[PDB]
Amino acid sequence: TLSILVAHDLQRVIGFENQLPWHLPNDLKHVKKLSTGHTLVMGRKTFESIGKPLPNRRNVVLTSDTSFNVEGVDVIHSIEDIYQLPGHVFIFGGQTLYEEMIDKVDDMYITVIEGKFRGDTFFPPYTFEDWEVASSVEGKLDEKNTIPHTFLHLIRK
Ligand SMILES: NC(=O)c1ccc[n+]([C@@H]2O[C@H](COP(=O)([O-])OP(=O)(O)OC[C@H]3O[C@@H](n4cnc5c(N)ncnc54)[C@H](OP(=O)(O)O)[C@@H]3O)[C@@H](O)[C@H]2O)c1
Numbered sequence: 089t090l091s092i093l094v095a096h097d098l099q100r101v102i103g104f105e106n107q108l109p110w111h112l113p114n115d116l117k118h119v120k121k122l123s124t125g126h127t128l129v130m131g132r133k134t135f136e137s138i139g140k141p142l143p144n145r146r147n148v149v150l151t152s153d154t155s156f157n158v159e160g161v162d163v164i165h166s167i168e169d170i171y172q173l174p175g176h177v178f179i180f181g182g183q184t185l186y187e188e189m190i191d192k193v194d195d196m197y198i199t200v201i202e203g204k205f206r207g208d209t210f211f212p213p214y215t216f217e218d219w220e221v222a223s224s225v226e227g228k229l230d231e232k233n234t235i236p237h238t239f240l241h242l243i244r245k
Pocket residue numbers: 093094095096101102103104105106107108130131132133134135137150151152153165166167180181182183184185188209
């Protein structure tokens with residue numbers, strides 16, 4: 089099982105200046121719940137942004153840099169390496185990885201952030217022509233979590 093795991097806004101912004109544009113504790117809990125006990129594949133910049141590997145799952149960083157050898161992180165050097173990892177693999181970002189993988193994955197877990205953020209990094213356009221909504225769940229709003237948001241599980245048709 090290969091899946092995309094992404095949050096993006098109404099214009100498919102995912103990133104600004106190597107961080108998430110929004111503060112949304114609930115999306116990160118969503119991420120924790122989905123990926124715990126499984127495998128994340130991410131690009132180097134995304135990892136640097138996050139600093140350390142997420143506890144309680146396999147962290148895999150795709151990078152060209154032969155000197156990368158960080159404790160708790162496995163490194164891969166080619167996309168083709170992804171297909172050799174066992175178990176449930178989530179493509180974790182960023183833009184380059186989504187572009188390379190979106191035609192390849194079984195499904196996508198997308199948080200739609202119902203807002204318009206200033207961004208420098210984007211999720212690629214897709215159609216629901218190609219993707220079936222297996223589920224759509226409204227995020228609940230509170231004072232911790234103030235941006236409307238929807239969790240989609242999409243499966244390739
Ligand atoms: N909203 C979300 O769900 C979400 C999730 C993740 C990240 N983000 C955001 O996305 C942005 C970062 O994305 P980004 O696209 O700029 O960078 P990125 O995907 O985090 O990392 C790009 C780097 O990954 C490595 N890489 C990618 N494809 C490769 C390949 N085929 N072979 C070898 N190495 C490869 C390269 O590392 P080297 O240059 O070291 O070789 C490349 O420079 C940030 O703003 C971040 O906050 C958002």
